[PDB]
Design a protein around this ligand. Structure first.
Ligand SMILES: [Mg+2]
Ligand SMILES: [Mg+2]
Ligand SMILES: [Mg+2]
Ligand SMILES: [Mg+2]
Ligand SMILES: [Mg+2]
Ligand SMILES: [Mg+2]
Ligand SMILES: [Mg+2]
Ligand SMILES: [Mg+2]
Ligand SMILES: [Mg+2]
Ligand SMILES: [Mg+2]
Ligand SMILES: [Mg+2]
Ligand SMILES: [Mg+2]
Ligand SMILES: [Mg+2]
Ligand SMILES: [Mg+2]
Ligand SMILES: [Mg+2]
Ligand SMILES: [Mg+2]
Ligand SMILES: [Mg+2]
Ligand SMILES: [Mg+2]
Ligand SMILES: [Mg+2]
Ligand SMILES: [Mg+2]
Ligand SMILES: [Mg+2]
Ligand SMILES: [Mg+2]
Ligand SMILES: [Mg+2]
Ligand SMILES: [Mg+2]
Ligand SMILES: [Mg+2]
Ligand SMILES: [Mg+2]
Ligand SMILES: [Mg+2]
Ligand SMILES: [Mg+2]
Ligand SMILES: [Mg+2]
Ligand SMILES: [Mg+2]
Ligand SMILES: [Mg+2]
Ligand SMILES: [Mg+2]
Ligand SMILES: [Mg+2]
Ligand SMILES: [Mg+2]
Ligand SMILES: [Mg+2]
Ligand SMILES: [Mg+2]
Ligand SMILES: [Mg+2]
Ligand SMILES: [Mg+2]
Ligand SMILES: [Mg+2]
Ligand SMILES: [Mg+2]
Ligand SMILES: [Mg+2]
Ligand SMILES: [Mg+2]
Ligand SMILES: [Mg+2]
Ligand SMILES: [Mg+2]
Ligand SMILES: [Mg+2]
Ligand SMILES: [Mg+2]
Ligand SMILES: [Mg+2]
Ligand SMILES: [Mg+2]
Ligand SMILES: [Mg+2]
Ligand SMILES: [Mg+2]
Ligand SMILES: [Mg+2]
Ligand SMILES: [Mg+2]
Ligand SMILES: [Mg+2]
Ligand SMILES: [Mg+2]
Ligand SMILES: [Mg+2]
Ligand SMILES: [Mg+2]
Ligand SMILES: [Mg+2]
Ligand SMILES: [Mg+2]
Ligand SMILES: [Mg+2]
Lengths: 102, 145, 124, 63
RNA sequence: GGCAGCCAACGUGUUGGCUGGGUAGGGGAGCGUCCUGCAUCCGGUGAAGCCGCCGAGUGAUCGAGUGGUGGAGGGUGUGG
RNA sequence: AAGUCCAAGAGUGCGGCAGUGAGACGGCGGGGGAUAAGCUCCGUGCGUCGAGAGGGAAACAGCCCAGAUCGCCGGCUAAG
RNA sequence: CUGUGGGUAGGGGUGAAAGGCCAAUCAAACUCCGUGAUAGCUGGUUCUCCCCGAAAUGCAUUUAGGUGCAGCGUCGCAUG
RNA sequence: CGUAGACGGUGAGAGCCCGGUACGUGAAAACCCGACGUCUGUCUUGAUGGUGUUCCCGAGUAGCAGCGGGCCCGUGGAAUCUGCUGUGAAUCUGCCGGGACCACCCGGUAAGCCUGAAUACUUCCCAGUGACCGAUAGCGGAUUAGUACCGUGAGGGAAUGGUGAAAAGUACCCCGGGAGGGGAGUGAAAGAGUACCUGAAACCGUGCGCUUACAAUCCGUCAGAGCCCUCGACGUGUCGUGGGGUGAUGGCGUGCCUUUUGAAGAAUGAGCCUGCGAGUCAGGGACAUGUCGCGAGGUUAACCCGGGUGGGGUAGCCGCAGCGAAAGCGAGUCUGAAUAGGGCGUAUCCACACAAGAGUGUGUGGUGUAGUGGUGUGUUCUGGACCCGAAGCGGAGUGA
C-alpha cells in the first residue's frame, strides 16, 4: 500500500512517463540518454524502471548524477518518493501492472 | 509532490523516552526508586511474599487430570450457516473452511444456537441434537462422516 | 555515536562564572564554589525584593515622624487625622514633602489636626 | 528467550470463559471429622480470586 | 501589571471564574550535545573552536547581532 | 432537607506507574515509670514539623500568626 | 655457628609447639581462570519548566533497618 | 567526456591535472579444476516354476538380576537407551519394538563394516563495508608494546600522534661561558621556530582604576556616600527614562551533598581545574497504553528468488463456544433423585408480553458482537541488567 500511495502521488502530478527504450541499438551511450531524459523531465532526480535484460539502457543512464535505476520487481517506496519523476520502460510498466492487478 | 522530507509520523505515534538519573528537574538521583532496601538495587521476585506461605502454595491444586487422548471439535452454529450460505446448498468441511467458519484441518461439530431458515445439506464430523432438528426441519440433510 | 561533553557542559559554567564576578576568593574563580554562592545570592535577592518594601516604608515613617514632631504632633495622630480628613497621600510622598517642602507638610499637619476628634481619648 | 509460566500457579488457578481467575479453597484435604458438613460445603467448589491477588496471579500465569 | 493550570462561555482564540509552597513519587511539555535520510543555505571576500562586547527568552538556554583570535568546515527545516 | 456546586479539584469501581511501611513535638484521654525524663507504649475528620518559605517568640524543625505564581520606592491588617 | 649443593608445596609442607614459619602477606600462600562471584548492607546515579502530591499505619513473615498485600499518591477509563 | 559523476591524491569543494574508475586485455612457470584418452577393474545364460518335522541367517550376544548413568521422566506403576558385576537363550512356530505386565494384531529383522550433500568454525591470505572509534576514545599496543617497568616465579603491565603547501628549519651581526634572547632573513602567517595547528580552565606574574591599618566578615544580598570610566543633550560643568567598575556605611543573612524525627552543624563525602565515569541491549518473550494496516478474520517461521530495503513461502500462532476431573454433552453445561437450588457460560443494549416487589426473573422478537499484525512508550521476565565495593568459595598452575 505504501508503494501504491507513492506511485499514485506521482501519477496525479503527471510525474510518470513511459518509454519504449532509453537508447536505440545495442551500444550504450550516455549522451543519447541524457538528451532524451532532458526532453522528458528537467527535474534533477529521476527513477528509471527497466527490465533485467535491458543492459544497454541501464548502462546508458547509470552514470548520470541524479538518475537511479531499478527493476520493476524491486520497486519500493523510498526510491519512488526520492525521485521527482518515474520513467518506465513499457515492458517494465506492463510487468509491474501484470504482477499486481492479476 | 510528496518527498522524503514530507514524511511525518502520525500525531501521538512517537513518545519521547524517559531518561532517569539526569538531574533533579526530572527523575534524577534515585531514578524513581525511593531510598534503600532491596528495591533500591534489585527487583523482588513475583512469587515472593516475604516468608508467608505464598498464595500459589497455600491453595490446593485444582482437582482432576487432563485426558491425553481427548478429541476436541471445532464448532459451527447453524445461525452462522444461514449468513454464510443464503442460497443454501451443499456445505461440507471444505465449504466451511473456505467461508472462514472453521480452521482448515480440524474436526467439525455443528451446533444448534442460531435459527435456520434455509435448506442445507450439511456434511460434518458430528452434530448436536438441536443441529439435527434445525437441519432436517428446514428440509435438509445432516450426514456425519 | 560517541558524544563529547565539553561543548554542552561549558555553557552553564560560563553563565555562572560571569554572574559571580566581583565575589571574593574561590567564589569568583571556581564554578562549583560560585554555583553554591549563586544559590544563596538569588535566594537573598528574592527575599530582599520582598523586604525592600517594608524597609522603605520604615524609612518614610521615620522621616514623617521627625517632621510631625517638629510640628508638635505625633506620627500616629497625624496618620489618624489625615485619614479623617480624607487625604490619600501615601507615606512615600508624605516623606518627600517632609524633606523637600516643609511648608506643604506643615499645611497637611494643620488639616490633620483640625479633623482629629475633640477628645482623642473619648469613646467612639 | 520465551517467558516461562509458573508451574505451581498453573496447577492452582484457572480462567473462565470471560477471563475471571478461579481457584479452589483450602482446609478440605484432611481433619474432616470435626468439620460440620455446612463448613465442608462452604469450602467446596471454585471461587473467583480476590481483587488484591488478581494482578500477581495474572503475572504468574502469563509468565 | 505580567505568566500559568482547570473549567465555563461563546468565537474560527479571546473573554471570564477558580486555582498555581512542596520531599518520596506520578503525569505533561521542552532546552542543549553528537551521528544520520531528505530538502535548502553560508564559508580562504575566512567555517568550527576559543576570548570579549552589546543585547534576548518564563527555564534548560539563545544570538543567520557584532569585535578579536583562528584556519576548513558549518547552519537551518523536517524526520531517523 | 438544604448548603458548597465556572468545585471540593469530593466519593465509588476497574486498570498503568509508584513511593511509604525508622517518625517528631505540642493539646486533650490513658497504660508502663516514682501518677520522673527532651522517657516509653496506645487513642484522638486533633495541630504543626516531616515535605513549609514569611511575621512573632533575643537566638530557637514540632508553640502563636499566616500557606510564598512573578513584579511594585502603594494601601489595610494578623500574632506580637 | 656458618658456606656451597640438594630435598619436603597448600587442607599440604615444616614446627625443642608461638597456630610459629612456607619470598616485607598465613586459623589454610601466591598467580591466572570460573568472574562483571554474591552482599535484605554503605556509597554514587548527570539539563529544564508546568500540574498533582504522599507515608513513617494494619496484617503476615527464619520477620523486626527486608518484603508481600491492604491503607495513603498519581495517570487513564467509567459513574456523576 | 561519460559502459568512466567509485574512492583517494594534487598548495583550499577536481568526471575532464595525477593514481585510478567503467570497460577491456594478459601467463613462461608452478599450482588447482575439468574434459578426453590411455590405463585399471568388472561382467557376459539367463528367465521360470515346484519341493521339504533339510541346512543357514553375525554368542558369552540377547534376555534376566544387582548397583549406577542418561532419557520431560529427581526410582517412580518406569518402558526405551547405556557402564560395571553375576547368570545366561533360541535361527523363523525364531527373536526384538509398539511406556509396568499378559494376550492378540501391527512394525522391524539386533549382536559386521563403509558412506557424499544440506550443518559448525577462521590462526592465516585477498577484495570490500559502517546513522562504528578518532589519541583519557578505538586493541593492552597509531609512538622500539607484550616493549619499559614490577615480581624468585607463574604472572602483572604502562606512558608518548598534528611545524609549514614546500624545510624555504632562521646566513650574517649584537649581549652571553652556554642556555636564551635582540636585530636581520625565509614564509600567506614565526599570533607556525623541530619546547612547533587551534591553544580552554585551574595555577603563577606585571601594569592601571577604585578600595582597605578602631576592626568581630557562610563572605553574599538589598539600600548606599565618595571616586573612576563611558553614552546622550546642553556648554566652560551638569542633568538624564542612562549604562559600566569600585564601594565607606546601614539593614537582612547558619556552606553544598548524603543521610536523618531533626544537621550551619563539632555526623558522611569533596584541596583545585580539565577530561572521563551509572535504567542499556537482545527476544513474532509477558501485561498495559499510544499509533498505523487489514478486519471475522489478522499474520507468516524456516526457507526460496532479487548486489537492497523487494517478491514469494500456510507449517504454525492468535481470534472464532462454553461447561465438566473426565467419558462427554453443547448455548448450554456441571452438581443432584429432582422438571429443586446454586456455579460457570450464552458481546452489549432496546421494545413487548408473563411471572415477581425476596433484591427482579423468565420467554419472544429485534440491535448486532472485534480481533490480529507492525511499531512508540511505561513496567516486567531470562541474561552482569542502573553503576561501584567485600571477607571469602572452586579449578589449574607458580613458589623452600
Ligand atoms: Mg528503542
Ligand atoms: Mg530528586
Ligand atoms: Mg545530586
Ligand atoms: Mg542513597
Ligand atoms: Mg529506610
Ligand atoms: Mg523502598
Ligand atoms: Mg526467577
Ligand atoms: Mg507587606
Ligand atoms: Mg481428599
Ligand atoms: Mg464430613
Ligand atoms: Mg486566563
Ligand atoms: Mg507546584
Ligand atoms: Mg499559594
Ligand atoms: Mg518528585
Ligand atoms: Mg550548536
Ligand atoms: Mg588567506
Ligand atoms: Mg562537527
Ligand atoms: Mg530527535
Ligand atoms: Mg518494618
Ligand atoms: Mg514501624
Ligand atoms: Mg507512633
Ligand atoms: Mg519522645
Ligand atoms: Mg505542612
Ligand atoms: Mg517556618
Ligand atoms: Mg495601619
Ligand atoms: Mg491584636
Ligand atoms: Mg633448593
Ligand atoms: Mg593460642
Ligand atoms: Mg612472611
Ligand atoms: Mg578455606
Ligand atoms: Mg558464573
Ligand atoms: Mg554487586
Ligand atoms: Mg498542591
Ligand atoms: Mg516461617
Ligand atoms: Mg506495597
Ligand atoms: Mg572525489
Ligand atoms: Mg541378524
Ligand atoms: Mg537416571
Ligand atoms: Mg516392550
Ligand atoms: Mg561410521
Ligand atoms: Mg585532542
Ligand atoms: Mg590507548
Ligand atoms: Mg610475590
Ligand atoms: Mg627480573
Ligand atoms: Mg595564522
Ligand atoms: Mg608547549
Ligand atoms: Mg600552539
Ligand atoms: Mg579606618
Ligand atoms: Mg556582634
Ligand atoms: Mg543578625
Ligand atoms: Mg540519630
Ligand atoms: Mg525523611
Ligand atoms: Mg561537616
Ligand atoms: Mg565545621
Ligand atoms: Mg554513620
Ligand atoms: Mg574529607
Ligand atoms: Mg562455606
Ligand atoms: Mg584461591
Ligand atoms: Mg616446585
Amino acid at each position: 500500500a505504501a508503494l501504491r500511495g507513492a506511485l499514485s502521488d506521482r501519477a496525479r502530478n503527471d510525474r510518470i512517463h513511459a518509454v519504449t527504450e532509453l537508447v536505440e541499438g545495442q551500444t550504450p551511450s550516455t549522451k543519447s540518454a541524457k538528451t532524451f531524459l532532458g526532453t522528458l523531465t528537467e527535474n534533477k532526480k529521476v527513477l528509471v524502471v527497466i527490465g533485467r535484460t535491458d543492459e544497454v539502457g541501464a548502462k546508458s543512464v547509470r552514470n548520470l548524477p541524479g538518475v537511479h535505476v531499478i527493476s520493476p520487481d524491486q520497486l519500493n517506496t523510498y526510491d519512488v518518493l526520492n525521485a521527482d519523476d518515474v520513467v518506465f520502460s513499457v515492458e517494465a510498466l506492463n510487468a509491474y501492472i501484470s504482477a499486481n492487478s492479476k | 509532490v510528496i518527498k522524503l522530507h514530507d514524511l511525518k509520523p502520525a500525531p501521538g505515534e512517537k513518545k519521547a523516552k524517559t531518561r532517569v538519573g539526569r538531574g533533579e528537574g526530572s527523575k534524577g538521583k534515585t531514578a524513581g526508586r525511593g531510598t534503600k532496601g532491596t528495591k533500591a538495587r534489585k527487583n523482588v521476585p513475583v512469587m515472593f511474599e516475604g516468608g508467608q506461605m505464598p498464595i500459589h502454595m497455600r491453595l490446593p491444586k485444582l482437582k482432576g487430570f487432563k485426558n491425553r487422548f481427548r478429541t476436541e471439535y471445532q464448532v459451527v452454529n447453524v445461525g452462522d450457516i444461514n449468513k454464510a450460505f443464503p442460497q443454501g446448498g451443499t456445505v461440507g468441511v471444505d465449504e466451511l473452511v473456505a467461508k472462514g467458519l472453521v480452521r482448515k484441518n480440524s474436526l467439525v461439530k455443528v451446533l444448534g444456537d442460531g435459527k435456520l431458515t434455509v435448506k442445507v445439506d450439511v456434511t460434518a464430523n458430528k452434530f448436536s441434537g438441536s443441529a439435527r432438528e434445525a437441519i432436517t426441519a428446514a428440509g435438509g440433510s445432516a450426514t456425519e462422516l | 555515536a560517541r558524544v563529547k561533553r565539553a561543548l554542552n557542559a561549558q555553557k552553564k559554567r560560563r553563565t555562572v562564572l560571569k554572574a559571580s564576578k566581583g565575589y571574593r576568593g574561590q567564589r569568583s574563580r571556581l564554578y562549583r564554589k560560585a554555583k553554591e554562592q549563586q544559590l544563596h545570592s538569588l535566594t537573598y535577592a528574592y527575599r530582599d525584593r520582598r523586604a525592600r518594601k517594608g524597609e522603605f516604608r520604615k524609612l518614610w515613617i521615620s522621616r514623617i515622624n521627625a517632621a510631625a514632631r517638629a510640628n508638635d504632633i505625633t506620627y500616629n495622630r497625624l496618620i489618624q487625622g489625615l485619614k479623617a480628613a480624607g487625604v490619600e497621600v501615601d507615606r512615600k510622598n508624605l516623606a518627600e514633602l517632609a524633606v523637600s517642602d516643609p511648608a506643604a507638610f506643615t499645611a497637611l499637619v494643620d488639616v490633620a489636626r483640625a479633623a482629629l476628634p475633640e477628645d482623642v481619648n473619648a469613646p467612639s | 528467550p520465551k517467558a516461562k509460566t509458573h508451574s505451581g500457579a498453573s496447577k492452582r488457578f484457572r480462567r473462565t470463559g470471560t477471563g475471571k481467575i478461579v481457584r479452589q479453597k483450602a482446609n478440605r484435604r484432611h481433619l474432616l471429622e470435626h468439620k460440620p458438613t455446612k463448613r465442608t460445603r462452604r469450602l467446596d467448589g471454585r471461587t473467583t480470586v480476590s481483587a488484591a491477588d488478581n494482578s500477581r496471579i495474572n503475572k504468574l500465569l502469563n509468565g
